[PDB]
Amino acid sequence: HSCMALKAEDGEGCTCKQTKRYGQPECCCMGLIVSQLPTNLTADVGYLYLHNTSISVITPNFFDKFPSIRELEIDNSAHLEHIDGSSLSVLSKLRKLSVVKCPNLREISGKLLVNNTRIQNVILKNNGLATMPSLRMTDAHHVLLDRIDLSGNKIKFISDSKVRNVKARTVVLSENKLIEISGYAFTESQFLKLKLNNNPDLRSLSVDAFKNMAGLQTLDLSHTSIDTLPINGLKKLKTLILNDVPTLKSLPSVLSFTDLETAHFTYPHHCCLFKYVDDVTMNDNGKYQRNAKEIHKRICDKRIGAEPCQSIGEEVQKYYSNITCYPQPDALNPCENIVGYPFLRIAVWVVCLAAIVGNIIVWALLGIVYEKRMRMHYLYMINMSVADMVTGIYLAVLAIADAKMSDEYYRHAVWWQTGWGCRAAGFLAVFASELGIISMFLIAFEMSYNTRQSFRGRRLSPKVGVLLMIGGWLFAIIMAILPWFDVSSYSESSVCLPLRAATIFDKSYLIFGLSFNFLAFAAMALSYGFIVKMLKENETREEDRALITKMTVLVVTDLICWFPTLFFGFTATIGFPLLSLSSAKFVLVFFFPINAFANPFLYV
Amino acid sequence: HSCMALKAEDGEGCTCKQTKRYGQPECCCMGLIVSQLPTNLTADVGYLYLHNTSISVITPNFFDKFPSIRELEIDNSAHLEHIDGSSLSVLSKLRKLSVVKCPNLREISGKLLVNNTRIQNVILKNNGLATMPSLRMTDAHHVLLDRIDLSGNKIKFISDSKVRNVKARTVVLSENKLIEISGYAFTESQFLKLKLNNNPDLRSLSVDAFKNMAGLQTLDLSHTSIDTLPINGLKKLKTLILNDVPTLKSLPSVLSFTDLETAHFTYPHHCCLFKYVDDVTMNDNGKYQRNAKEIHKRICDKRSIGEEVQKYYSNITCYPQPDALNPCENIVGYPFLRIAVWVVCLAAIVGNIIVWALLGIVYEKRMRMHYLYMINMSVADMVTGIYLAVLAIADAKMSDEYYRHAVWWQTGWGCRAAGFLAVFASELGIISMFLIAFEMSYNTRQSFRGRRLSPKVGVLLMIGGWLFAIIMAILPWFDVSSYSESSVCLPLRAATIFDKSYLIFGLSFNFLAFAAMALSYGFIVKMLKENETREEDRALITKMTVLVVTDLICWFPTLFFGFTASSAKFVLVFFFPINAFANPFLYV
Numbered sequence A: 001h002s003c004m005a006l007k008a009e010d011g012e013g014c015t016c017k018q019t020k021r022y023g024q025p026e027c028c029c030m031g032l033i034v035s036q037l038p039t040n041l042t043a044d045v046g047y048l049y050l051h052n053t054s055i056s057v058i059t060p061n062f063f064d065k066f067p068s069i070r071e072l073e074i075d076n077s078a079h080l081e082h083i084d085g086s087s088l089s090v091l092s093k094l095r096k097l098s099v100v101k102c103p104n105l106r107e108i109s110g111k112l113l114v115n116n117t118r119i120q121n122v123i124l125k126n127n128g129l130a131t132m133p134s135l136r137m138t139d140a141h142h143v144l145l146d147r148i149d150l151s152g153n154k155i156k157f158i159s160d161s162k163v164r165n166v167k168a169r170t171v172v173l174s175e176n177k178l179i180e181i182s183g184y185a186f187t188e189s190q191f192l193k194l195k196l197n198n199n200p201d202l203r204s205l206s207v208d209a210f211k212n213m214a215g216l217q218t219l220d221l222s223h224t225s226i227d228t229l230p231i232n233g234l235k236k237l238k239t240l241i242l243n244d245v246p247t248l249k250s251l252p253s254v255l256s257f258t259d260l261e262t263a264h265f266t267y268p269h270h271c272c273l274f275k276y277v278d279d280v281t282m283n284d285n286g287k288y289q290r291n292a293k294e295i296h297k298r299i300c301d302k303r304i305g306a307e308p309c310q311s312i313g314e315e316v317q318k319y320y321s322n323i324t325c326y327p328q329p330d331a332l333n334p335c336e337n338i339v340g341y342p343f344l345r346i347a348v349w350v351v352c353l354a355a356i357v358g359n360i361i362v363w364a365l366l367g368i369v370y371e372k373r374m375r376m377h378y379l380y381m382i383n384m385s386v387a388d389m390v391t392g393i394y395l396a397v398l399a400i401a402d403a404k405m406s407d408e409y410y411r412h413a414v415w416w417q418t419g420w421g422c423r424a425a426g427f428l429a430v431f432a433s434e435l436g437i438i439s440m441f442l443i444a445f446e447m448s449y450n451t452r453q454s455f456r457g458r459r460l461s462p463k464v465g466v467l468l469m470i471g472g473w474l475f476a477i478i479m480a481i482l483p484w485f486d487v488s489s490y491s492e493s494s495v496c497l498p499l500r501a502a503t504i505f506d507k508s509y510l511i512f513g514l515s516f517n518f519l520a521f522a523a524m525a526l527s528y529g530f531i532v533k534m535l536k537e538n539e540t541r542e543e544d545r546a547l548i549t550k551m552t553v554l555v556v557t558d559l560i561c562w563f564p565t566l567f568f569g570f571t572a573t574i575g576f577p578l579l580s581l582s583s584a585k586f587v588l589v590f591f592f593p594i595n596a597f598a599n600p601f602l603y604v
Numbered sequence B: 001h002s003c004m005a006l007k008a009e010d011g012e013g014c015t016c017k018q019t020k021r022y023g024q025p026e027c028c029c030m031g032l033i034v035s036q037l038p039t040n041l042t043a044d045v046g047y048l049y050l051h052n053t054s055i056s057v058i059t060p061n062f063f064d065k066f067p068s069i070r071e072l073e074i075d076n077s078a079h080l081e082h083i084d085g086s087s088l089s090v091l092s093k094l095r096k097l098s099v100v101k102c103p104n105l106r107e108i109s110g111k112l113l114v115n116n117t118r119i120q121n122v123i124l125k126n127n128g129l130a131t132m133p134s135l136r137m138t139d140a141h142h143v144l145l146d147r148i149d150l151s152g153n154k155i156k157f158i159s160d161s162k163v164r165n166v167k168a169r170t171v172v173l174s175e176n177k178l179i180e181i182s183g184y185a186f187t188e189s190q191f192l193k194l195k196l197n198n199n200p201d202l203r204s205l206s207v208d209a210f211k212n213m214a215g216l217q218t219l220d221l222s223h224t225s226i227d228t229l230p231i232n233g234l235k236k237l238k239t240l241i242l243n244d245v246p247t248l249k250s251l252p253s254v255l256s257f258t259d260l261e262t263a264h265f266t267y268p269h270h271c272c273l274f275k276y277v278d279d280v281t282m283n284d285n286g287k288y289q290r291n292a293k294e295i296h297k298r299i300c301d302k303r304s305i306g307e308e309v310q311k312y313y314s315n316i317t318c319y320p321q322p323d324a325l326n327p328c329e330n331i332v333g334y335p336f337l338r339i340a341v342w343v344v345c346l347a348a349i350v351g352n353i354i355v356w357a358l359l360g361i362v363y364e365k366r367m368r369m370h371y372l373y374m375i376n377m378s379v380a381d382m383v384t385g386i387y388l389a390v391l392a393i394a395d396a397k398m399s400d401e402y403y404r405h406a407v408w409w410q411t412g413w414g415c416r417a418a419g420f421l422a423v424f425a426s427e428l429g430i431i432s433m434f435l436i437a438f439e440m441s442y443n444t445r446q447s448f449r450g451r452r453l454s455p456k457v458g459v460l461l462m463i464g465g466w467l468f469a470i471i472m473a474i475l476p477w478f479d480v481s482s483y484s485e486s487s488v489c490l491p492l493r494a495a496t497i498f499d500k501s502y503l504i505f506g507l508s509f510n511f512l513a514f515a516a517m518a519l520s521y522g523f524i525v526k527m528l529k530e531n532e533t534r535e536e537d538r539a540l541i542t543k544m545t546v547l548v549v550t551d552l553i554c555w556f557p558t559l560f561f562g563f564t565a566s567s568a569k570f571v572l573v574f575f576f577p578i579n580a581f582a583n584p585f586l587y588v
């Protein structure tokens, strides 16, 4: 409160007062005037506080004047360049140490907290610390550190055996710019919760970085580029947190963990990898075979009467089932199966074969009905057949993937889902959908303009029609190739559809798609009405009047099918996952595929 | 191990060895030469083993000769006719009891397991018993029986009040020909887990079969064929697995149970009744109102009444969770989709009436097999409409109710007839769609040459196609496929080997017929382009060509979505009937 009284006085000086609650007096120094603490200062001070004094650098003998110090705090000191930790450590009875808002405090040297058996907690946050303090410890400390914090600093490396024998609950290294943690970074220490989150640049961890530790209850690595989690030392974690670490493709063996109860992973399939371990756990037959032999008794020795100990291959899975994982699998990211129900499997196979057969029918019957004179709309019908063929290829990819990956999907799931293959599948699907939409709109507009101007005596240029076709093709291609990048990812579904909306920009992409669907529906309705009016004005030819009738059936069926599409989208304004997303998938796989599959029987 | 080692040296005889580990000597007998009790024997038999023994009958004097026997094991007693439980009861020194592979054991008399508070296991494996032993444990017993087992046997009956207070942890009566279980079969017995699996013949489980017993933590009736389940006794039950029981469609309400922690059922609607009990719990209001008050007091001491009870029940997970193939509380799932199917069925029926009027006005006076083909296509459209209507009214009748009485609709007759109508309508429509193009092609080709298809042949082929649709529709009534596995009543199951063949053959045949029809119409249009027919036929040819092409466009996508895919039900219910009623518009 001495600092508060000084700030109320606004006098850049040191003021002290004695408190009866603790006996020792409290002194605070403040302002730019004080370059060093004045000599006429009491020595029995327990609590020493410094508000942005002009101390440029703490000398190795700076704090030695006052032996009875018990608490320290330094704040806002913009002039602090370097501090020698030894002089601070000479303070035997130092209970708490805090340093904040020092921007230029580039280094703290020496083995801190050594020879100081009374430290209770350390707070070092929002400082320009450019290297890890060399924290050592010894077993004399009667009270463990409540919290030791280095968050908000700029540390980048943790060399061999930097933090030894510290006994503490919470240790935090978040927000730092770590690039590597070397082997044996910790040693002999026990931590209740070690924090390593919000560290974008952390790529490589040494395989034995957490080896030789004396205990680690909970650990979190969220927002990290960790490639492979270390195997050793982590054999006792109660909880594991690997949130938002897309580089963590393949986890180390689930067998190694022994007592974990809660685990948050980034990809959902690791949850099933933990759950579906039912047949995997008994296969180790090594050191963890002994560990399993030991853990089974640990439960079954104490679990009217009671069941006997079932074998080490069933009770271990019974215990492992209790392990809760947050990215739980769903119908959109299923385990052991891609398509699931056998009816759907055989239906997908037959429908892929039938889509290919329909494209073949398009080719053959269009060649049969082909007129000698070049026609503008033959190319459009061919492009719609191409859209149908792409849909068939997408379903073929899904079918063959389900055929190959059956019964072992959860192991291979992440590689397929994030891999190049899923991006290709999503490209195929969305490109087919957009190509069909733009092709329907283009053929409707071309027929409308040709019919309308032909009766008046003019015509829309067929080269303009080809230009519109290539413009729509580029539209579909750019709509499909963009989600390859992070505008909207294909990795959020097991069938590679773009059910992605997290960055709000992906929401912009989906809004653009929905708006284009609405514009296509409105344009088709209006252009078809105008076509009906023009047909009322004048009649068409005969041998190609089959195509005119096909346009009329487009007038009917396109409106019939796209009318409930927007209605379902509007009724799904809540956007409930796994229900509205399924509706969107069904809409995409129905309504463009309507015309796509119709193409043979439509065009004949 | 020691007995087998001694037997390996051509041990066609009885032999004894004084093992230092057990103190008392171990004795073994082997070979058909041992047709009776041992010749001169030893009186200090500690462990007893008899393998492939030619013993004929057992009399209490057999064991009284050497009352020191502590463990017993009888194996491969091929000739063994009968044993008396009294003989083993007198041998109170016994702790182990094994009897295996007896091929013709007809009966075991007396009360086995009585008089002996030291037996720890009773392992009767494949004894072929034609009547179960009257096993009993008296009040004086104190050793926890580790396991009592009756493996593959000929136990046709359990009879009333058979078993008296057995204290075994696990009772296994599996792989049995049980035809009936009279009441009180396990009176006052205390069991931890009871397994009755793999007894197909069990069809008369009494209401008091498990009455008054001291309780079971788990009860297993896997692969039974029971017609009902008693309410009494199972109140304390902690685990009930009823996988693959096909006949238990009248399960008492989950409220009757009080301590389930895990349950298995073959029909997911039972688990939906578990979760949706929310409105059923308070409906009881009988003496079970007092029972529910008691259990609510217990639950609240353990840590509104209805919400807490339903949370507790939701904690009772069941493996057959509900699925999209049979959504609970509704067939339509959505109210907007309900009005959509209502409007499509109304459009179907109104269009059918309009088509009746149109056929009445435009019908040609002269006989025409073409008009017959059009009539049967209109009938196919009408039956699609009636299938739509019955599904819609079934949803309306069971609005919000589709967890009670759900099973009877799927299995009893409603789904059977509805699926019959649906598939018959679809197949008749497809086959008529093929026949009309076949008529067009045959008439087009032959008339130019100067011939015509036989009208009798055409009528007979139309009747044959009608019969093909009928036989395709009737088959899933049997076990070749199933209507039962969907609230929409469509034939969705594909599990059995024949089911996959049936389903894939149906779909592939439909699409192949459509492709062949398209090829035939391509031939027709090529002929028309090359040669000009008579104008009277030319107008009719053009009208029918437009009709067929428009019908193709309307029909095709429905099966595509039904295969590539709630919304599946919506599309099958909406777009296909839309084609069905839109096609006559293209007819006229």
Ligand SMILES: CC(C)CCC[C@@H](C)[C@H]1CC[C@H]2[C@@H]3CC=C4C[C@@H](O)CC[C@]4(C)[C@H]3CC[C@]12C
Pocket: A560, A563, A564, A567, B340, B347, B578, B582, B585
């Ligand atoms: C489910 C909601 C969103 C949309 C439902 C679509 C309804 C309104 C559509 C689909 C099929 C349509 C019918 C299709 C064909 C014809 C013939 C034509 O002369 C117009 C009327 C009539 C009879 C249409 C009436 C409107 C109709 C019934």
Ligand SMILES: *[C@@H]1O[C@H](CO)[C@@H](O)[C@H](O)[C@H]1NC(C)=O
Pocket: A012, A030, A031, A032, A051, A052, A076
């Ligand atoms: C501390 O910081 C302020 C703000 O930069 C600075 O102006 C001031 O001189 C320092 N001392 C006090 C007492 O505010």
Ligand SMILES: *[C@@H]1O[C@H](CO)[C@@H](O)[C@H](O)[C@H]1NC(C)=O
Pocket: A014, A016, A038, A040, A041
């Ligand atoms: C120490 O002396 C300085 C001047 O030398 C004076 O301003 C200050 O108040 C003194 N402080 C104490 C605690 O005596």
Ligand SMILES: *[C@@H]1O[C@H](CO)[C@@H](O)[C@H](O)[C@H]1NC(C)=O
Pocket: A090, A114, A115
């Ligand atoms: C600090 O501890 C080290 C540990 O080796 C010891 O050598 C040193 O003398 C101590 N210094 C003081 C000032 O107590």
Ligand SMILES: *[C@@H]1O[C@H](CO)[C@@H](O)[C@H](O)[C@H]1NC(C)=O
Pocket: B014, B015, B038, B039, B040, B041
């Ligand atoms: C029976 O008597 C024979 C001959 O005296 C003796 O050797 C043998 O040990 C006895 N027991 C058996 C089982 O043959």
Ligand SMILES: *[C@@H]1O[C@H](CO)[C@@H](O)[C@H](O)[C@H]1NC(C)=O
Pocket: B031, B032, B052, B076, B078
């Ligand atoms: C029992 O032993 C006899 C004679 O050694 C042998 O023929 C017979 O096969 C054996 N029993 C069985 C079931 O094999």
Ligand SMILES: *[C@@H]1O[C@H](CO)[C@@H](O)[C@H](O)[C@H]1NC(C)=O
Pocket: B090, B114, B115, B138, B140
């Ligand atoms: C055991 O049987 C004997 C006669 O065999 C009988 O006297 C006795 O009461 C029985 N004991 C028990 C505990 O049933």
